[PDB]
């Protein structure tokens, strides 16, 4: 409603770096808000794509940003009559960033790993990795829970059970208020998908450079499954957290499995022990139901509500014809211990191939009416097909069926404007929450400031 679409702020990065593929707000020790941006194709030392992370300070005019430096050299450790290897080429560092406290977590979902023992090997596979940083202090740390030292032959004998060689940890990420990092790994357990949790404080205190393989006793990974319903479901394609069991001491995880049950797609709510509390099934096959999940209380009843995006949903139209537009589902949490019923509201896209639902960002209370609001991206929507972000306002009955505001893309075609979003943070300190939008196709980030309501 009251986002300023006239005077935007534009940050930018190297060409072809996909700057803006991921972003999040970041407050230092003094509360000074910044913007961390990921560029998963930034050039490395050997003029080869390795990705990178930038930490943009707030400036109403925007501009260029400084790099948040990480180690981009391949590592090797000969130990235990084995040879450990890390390959950061094409790793995609910055394919997902998230901030908590004064710490930044940037992940490289396709960092490869291989263990050599004489003539055998564990196979070179993308286990993924996440780089953690405390910008003010300069501290650095890493977390790669899916690394292993088991050889290829062993997996074959065991029928490829508990195979964490293709996790791609960091594909999605979130951090609980308590400080527990949760990494989605849609390739874990032979493309079933796993989660991996671990306290940030324990990641830092247990990391030392060069070790490559170290223990984080307090971590907690999810479990394999012999169920064909979970096969090739990419469990962990998208992750979030919230409160869905009433007990405020526990933190519940939300996970997206967009190809679950033979591309029917689903999303499950769990506890910190990965025990499924609820499961929400896709409405249509190959709609990628679960591509993006969001948690926020939209009806102002204290209870977090769930929002799920199915970017490729094909709406039914006249003469028995289907049109890919996308869709978003709203699930309101019921009072006390009760299951989440049918979706309270269906938001369907308009622009063909627009992928309405490819991202969903809680905005907080934008118009300050007491109900939290959201922003839905259509990276290829709008009458021009350049991009579009639609703001839906909260209300007692859930959400408004129609958008209060639409943000058309200031970038050219192919910018993927809206592929990433983030809101609910007041960056200019004017009392209203603001929205940042990424456009990795144009290597830029567009900050929308929220102004007092005009009406």
């Amino acid at each position, epitope marked *: 409603l009251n986002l300023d679409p006239v005077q935007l702020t534009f940050y930018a990065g190297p060409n072809g770096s996909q700057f803006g593929f991921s972003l999040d707000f970041h407050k230092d020790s003094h509360g000074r808000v910044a913007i961390v941006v990921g560029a998963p194709r930034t050039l490395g030392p050997s003029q080869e794509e390795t990705g990178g992370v930038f930490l943009c300070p707030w400036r109403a005019e925007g501009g260029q940003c400084p790099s948040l430096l990480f180690d981009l050299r391949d590592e090797t*450790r000969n130990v*235990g009559s084995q040879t450990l290897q890390t390959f950061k080429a094409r790793q995609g560092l910055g394919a997902s960033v998230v901030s908590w406290s004064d710490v930044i977590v940037a992940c490289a979902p396709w960092q490869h790993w291989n263990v050599l023992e004489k003539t055998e090997e564990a196979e070179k596979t993308p286990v993924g990795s996440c780089f953690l940083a405390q910008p003010e202090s300069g501290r650095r740390a890493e977390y790669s829970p899916c690394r292993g030292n088991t050889l290829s032959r062993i997996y074959v004998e065991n029928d490829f059970s508990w195979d964490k060689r293709y996790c791609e940890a960091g594909f999605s990420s979130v951090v609980t208020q308590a400080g527990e990092l949760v990494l989605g790994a849609p390739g874990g357990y032979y493309f079933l998908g796993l989660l991996a949790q671990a306290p940030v404080a324990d990641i830092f205190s247990s990391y*030392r450079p060069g*070790i490559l393989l170290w*223990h984080v006793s307090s971590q907690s990974l999810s479990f394999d499954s012999s169920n064909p319903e979970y096969f090739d479901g990419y469990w962990g394609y998208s992750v979030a957290v919230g409160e869905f069991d009433g007990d405020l001491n526990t933190t519940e995880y939300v996970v997206g499995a967009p190809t679950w049950s033979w591309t029917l797609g689903a999303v499950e709510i769990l506890d910190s022990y990965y025990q499924r509390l609820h499961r929400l099934r896709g409405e249509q096959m190959a709609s990628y139901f679960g591509h993006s999940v969001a948690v926020t209380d939209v009806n102002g009843d204290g209870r977090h509500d769930l929002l799920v995006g199915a970017p490729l949903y094909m709406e039914s139209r006249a003469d028995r014809k289907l049109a890919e537009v996308g869709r978003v589902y709203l699930f309101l949490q019921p009072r006390g211990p009760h299951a989440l019923g049918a979706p309270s509201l269906l938001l369907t896209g308009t622009q063909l191939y627009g992928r309405f639902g490819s991202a969903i960002a809680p905005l907080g209370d934008l118009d300050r009416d007491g109900y939290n609001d959201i922003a839905v991206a259509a990276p290829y929507g709008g009458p021009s097909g350049r991009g579009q972000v639609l703001v839906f306002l909260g209300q007692s009955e859930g959400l408004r069926s129609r958008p209060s505001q639409v943000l058309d893309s200031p970038f050219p075609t192919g910018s993927a404007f809206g592929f990433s979003l983030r809101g609910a943070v007041d960056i200019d300190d004017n009392g209203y929450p603001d929205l940042i939008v990424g456009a990795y196709g144009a290597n830029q980030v567009a900050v929308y400031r929220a102004q007092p309501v005009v009406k």
Partner: antibody
Framework: EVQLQQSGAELVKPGASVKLSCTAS????????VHWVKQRPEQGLEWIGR????????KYDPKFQGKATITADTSSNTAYLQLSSLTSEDTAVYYC????????????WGQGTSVTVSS | DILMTQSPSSMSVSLGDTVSITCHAS??????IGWLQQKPGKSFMGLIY???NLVDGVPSRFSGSGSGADYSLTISSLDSEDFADYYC?????????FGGGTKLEIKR
């Protein structure tokens, strides 16, 4: 806190078989590798072998192959070391070891089990 | 098997001194070395791992160093408890092999 409660001292006769234990306290035995080390005053320290309690795979020093046999039961949260066809040279103190962070290190040690072989 | 020549076998020193134990390997081990302490009539305690990294709870006066095949443990400002046995252990290759040992004795 990580502590490795090893079994009490053993006193057996030559030619018999003994089985030492190494119960874990404050953590799951299944977390890390578990090594066994033999210590003698003159000879010094000797690495027997290791075991991954999660899967049961093991490695041994070719000096103790046949003599030493390491096992582990995740249920009781304990790891074992069996020594067959004992002799006088098998008179030594035996320690169970696990690493702290590094996968391949030797940081935490039990109190040790004293073994004496004599008729 | 890798041989670990640990020297000296013993040294007589006093409190507050700064001593340095060395450990020589039959081949390169790239910082894959650990240092241990055994107080008299007691079990072992971890001091160092991967060359230079201290084990949690260890005083900062301890410090490892070195590379290739030659490494060294250094204790700055000796304390009364520091008088004990000390061993080095390589885990670059299987089987793991320890050093001869070094006993810190009180001088007089």
């Amino acid at each position: 806190e990580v502590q490795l409660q090893q079994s009490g001292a053993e006193l057996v006769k030559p030619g018999a078989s003994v089985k030492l234990s190494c119960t874990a306290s404050g953590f799951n035995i299944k977390d890390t590798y578990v090594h066994w080390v033999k210590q003698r005053p003159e000879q010094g320290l000797e690495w027997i072998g290791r075991i991954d309690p999660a899967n049961g795979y093991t490695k041994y020093d070719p000096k103790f192959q046949g003599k030493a046999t390491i096992t582990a039961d995740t249920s009781s949260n304990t790891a074992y070391l069996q020594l067959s066809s004992l002799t006088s040279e098998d008179t030594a103190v035996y320690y169970c070891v696990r690493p702290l962070y590094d996968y391949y290190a030797m940081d935490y040690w039990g109190q040790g089990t004293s073994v004496t072989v004599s008729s | 098997d890798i041989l670990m020549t640990q020297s000296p076998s013993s040294m007589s020193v006093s409190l507050g001194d700064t001593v340095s134990i060395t450990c020589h390997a039959s081949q390169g081990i790239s910082s894959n070395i650990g240092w241990l302490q055994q107080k008299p009539g007691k079990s072992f305690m971890g001091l160092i791992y991967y060359g230079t990294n201290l084990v949690d709870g260890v005083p900062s006066r301890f410090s490892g160093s070195g590379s290739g095949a030659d490494y060294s443990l250094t204790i700055s400002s000796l304390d009364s408890e520091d008088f004990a046995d000390y061993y080095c252990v390589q885990y670059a290759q299987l089987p793991y092999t320890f050093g001869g040992g070094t006993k810190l004795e009180i001088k007089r």
